[PDB]
């Protein structure tokens, strides 16, 4: 046993994986085995959901998060997001589950049987963390790999059946994307949009043309960057700006994943295009607006003039203006006037909600949709009692939007913590005091007093 106790490694059991920092073979085992864990989960969870899946219930009433993802890609669903074939889900789950056996095999092999170090074994697979060039090279490889992934999405969208489009004219459906947005002005224009209300940065992407074009851009960008990094070594300013050690790169990736986690949280919370409400349930905004729509409809049916109806506050009971004049649902749902959804937009005119369309053009499918979304608002208890916190037991429901948003906030946050921990440690270790202050060389003791 080499380096598998504290005396020899300097790391206690609870920091055990740091014993792997410089054991590239065993460390590869750790990584591949871990990827095994991820694919394993994708597969087993998918099979579970499917075994548990009742096709005539909406997915979001059944606690599904993965089936919604497969379905978003256009597999197994038709018009309105209705399930027409569960077999594609079965395939995804099974193929993941099988692949996981392979990753686990390689991982375990590398972890306990394979070479502890790869450097004497192979110069290509071996690496020194401080070897900046080998690092940007491996990074480059993974960048080309990710780019290929994004283009796999593009392929699914353009040549292998398309994607689920909640916005499809005449109603949501799987649709082939023939004209993805290539214009760099629009695509990077998203990246320069405000993250505040009514702009919502990248989260505002509201059509599949933009999604697919964006991924064309991203694929080509990532492959180009990867090639770039195989063919180059880091410039002087980069050499002088960063820490070059395993733990440091780790800290950087932790930071990035943290950032991405928060982005995903908001994505699943607000976006109903790449997270169609048919599969994931309504957004909070969608549902508040849906309440307003529902009662506007009800009372107008009862004979109410909803345009001229003055609420208790002086604001319109049903309809009022946004701070820029757009006609919006009134009451508290005023905050959500930036909401956009396929069921509401036909009621939308140049100036916002059109009173004549409201009076004359509301179709039964809109009332139905509004009622469904209103009553499947993303509210629920930890034990999954649906509705407001004071609601009685009856409904077994927590929106998938809440599960996914909350999970990723908790995770993104702890990864930010991990980022801080490991970036600060990489700094201390690089500078040589991560284990504490030299008693005979206490830096502060050589500093002048402050006063």
């Amino acid at each position: 046993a080499t380096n598998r106790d504290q005396e020899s490694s300097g790391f206690a059991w609870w920091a055990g994986n740091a014993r792997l920092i410089n054991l590239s073979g065993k460390l590869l085992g750790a990584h591949v085995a871990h990827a095994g864990l991820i694919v394993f989960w994708a597969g087993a969870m998918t099979l579970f959901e499917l075994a548990h899946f009742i096709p005539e219930k909406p997915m979001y009433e059944q606690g599904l998060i993965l089936i919604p993802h497969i379905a978003t890609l256009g597999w197994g669903v038709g018009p309105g997001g209705e399930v027409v074939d569960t077999f594609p889900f079965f395939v995804v789950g099974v193929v993941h589950l099988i692949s996981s056996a392979v990753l686990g095999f390689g991982g375990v092999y590398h972890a306990i049987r394979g070479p502890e170090t790869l450097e004497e074994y192979s110069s290509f697979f071996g690496y020194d963390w401080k070897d900046k060039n080998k690092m940007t090279t491996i990074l480059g490889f993974h960048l080309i790999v990710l780019g290929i992934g994004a283009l796999l999405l593009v392929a699914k969208a353009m040549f292998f059946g398309g994607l689920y489009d909640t916005w499809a004219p005449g109603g949501g459906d799987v649709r082939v994307i023939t004209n993805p947005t290539l214009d760099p002005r629009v695509i990077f224009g998203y990246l320069l949009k405000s993250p505040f209300g009514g702009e919502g940065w990248i989260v505002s992407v509201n059509n599949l043309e933009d999604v697919v074009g964006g991924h064309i851009w991203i694929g080509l960008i990532c492959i180009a960057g990867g090639i770039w990094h195989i063919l180059t070594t880091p410039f002087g300013w980069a050499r002088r700006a960063f820490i070059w050690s395993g733990e440091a790169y780790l800290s950087y990736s932790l930071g990035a994943l943290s950032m991405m986690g928060f982005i995903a949280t908001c994505f699943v919370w607000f976006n109903n295009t790449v997270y169609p409400s048919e599969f994931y349930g309504p957004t909070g905004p969608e549902a508040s607006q849906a309440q307003a729509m529902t009662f506007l409809i009800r009372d107008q049916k009862l004979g109410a003039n909803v345009g001229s109806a003055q609420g208790p506050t002086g604001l319109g009971k049903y309809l009022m203006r946004s701070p820029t004049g757009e006609i919006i649902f009134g009451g508290e749902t005023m905050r959500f006037w930036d909401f956009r959804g396929p069921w509401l937009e036909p009621l939308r005119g140049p100036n916002g909600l059109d009173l004549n369309k409201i009076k004359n053009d509301i179709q039964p499918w809109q009332e139905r949709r509004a009622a469904e979304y209103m009553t499947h608002a993303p509210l629920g208890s930890l034990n999954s009692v649906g509705g407001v916190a004071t609601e009685i037991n009856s409904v077994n429901f927590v929106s998938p939007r809440s599960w996914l948003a909350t999970s990723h906030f908790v995770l993104a946050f702890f990864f930010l913590v991990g980022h801080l921990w490991h970036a600060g440690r990489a700094r201390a270790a690089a500078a040589g005091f991560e284990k504490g202050i030299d008693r005979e060389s206490e830096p502060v003791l050589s500093m002048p007093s402050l006063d």
């Binding site: 700006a241 960063f242 820490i243 070059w244 700094r427 690089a430 500078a431 040589g432 005091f433 830096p443």
Partner: protein, 38 residues
């Protein structure tokens, strides 16, 4: 009010640039121990 906007924008950009170039300015070297981290 547009002048206020431009003022603040310039100020902010200024301080941000100070932050970025500042940390780009051989920050790993600014410690009491091992400076050769390049």
């Amino acid at each position: 009010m547009e002048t206020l906007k431009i003022t603040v924008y310039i100020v902010v950009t200024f301080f941000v640039l100070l932050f970025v170039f500042g940390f780009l300015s051989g920050d790993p070297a600014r410690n009491p121990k091992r400076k050769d981290l390049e």
